């Protein structure tokens, strides 16, 4: 059974930074593409990052490109999301996701909330 | 034009009844395959199905067979035959486009289904 559990969220201010983690299990982590997706307080879903199975490639939408950095440590079965130069708009529930077939978001974690104050 | 998804209005349903939820792709992308997601209160979103242009689809795990999909041009429909209290959720569609130069993935604004 595939499981993903995020952590690292908390209260932060604009301009600050924090790093999120996703512990993965129930499957061979090094074989799948991983993603981060977030949900704003308004409940709108928004893709924020992609990283290939071996960490070779990464993609980001313009809203976070240049500020966020997705990475992974395959030996630790852990996905990460470094969030820098935080903005009020970064406030959201952050989900870690794995795909299946051609579907990007086949499996989701429980999420961790990042709250940007001020 | 931009890749966008427009979802039908939110509505209420009566048990046993049948529901049809709509998600419209931008005309320039009417051939695209999309995904339906179901999110119940305080639960992570959940993968429901992948719906192609010819309407063929494959559902994810844990999805009752009373869930089906079909297409009509740019429209992509999520059909829920019969209905149960557990179907009460927000249904969101999404569409990916792995363009080498730059990946894209858009979600619709969701359709809240009450029962």
């Amino acid at each position: 059974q595939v499981q993903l559990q995020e952590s690292g969220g908390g209260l932060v201010q604009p301009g600050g930074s924090l790093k999120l983690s996703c512990a993965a299990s129930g499957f061979t982590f090094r074989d799948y593409y991983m993603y981060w997706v977030r949900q704003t307080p308004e409940k709108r879903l928004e893709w924020v990052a992609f990283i290939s199975n071996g960490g070779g490639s990464t993609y980001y939408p313009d809203t976070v490109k240049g500020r966020f950095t997705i990475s992974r440590d395959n030996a630790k079965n852990t996905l990460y999301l470094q969030m820098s130069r935080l903005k009020s708009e970064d406030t959201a529930m952050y989900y870690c996701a794995r795909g299946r077939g051609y579907v990007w978001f086949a499996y989701w974690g429980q999420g961790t909330t990042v709250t940007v104050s001020s | 034009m931009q890749l966008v998804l427009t979802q039908s209005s939110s509505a209420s349903f009566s048990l046993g009844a049948s529901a049809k939820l709509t998600c419209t792709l931008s005309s320039q992308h009417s051939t695209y395959t999309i995904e339906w997601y179901q999110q119940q209160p305080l639960k992570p979103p959940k993968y429901v199905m992948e719906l192609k242009k010819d309407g063929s689809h494959s559902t994810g795990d844990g999805i009752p067979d009373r869930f089906s999909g079909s297409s009509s041009g740019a429209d992509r429909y999520l059909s829920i035959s019969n209905i149960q209290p557990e179907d009460e959720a927000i249904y969101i569609c999404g569409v990916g486009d792995t363009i080498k130069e730059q990946f894209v993935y858009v979600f619709g604004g969701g359709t809240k289904v009450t029962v």
Binding site: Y32, Y33, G101 | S27, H29, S30, T33, T98
Partner: peptide, 11 residues
């Protein structure tokens, strides 16, 4: 119109 791009999620 535009042809959609996809990838296998496992490799």
């Amino acid at each position: 119109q535009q042809q959609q791009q996809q990838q296998q999620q496992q490799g």
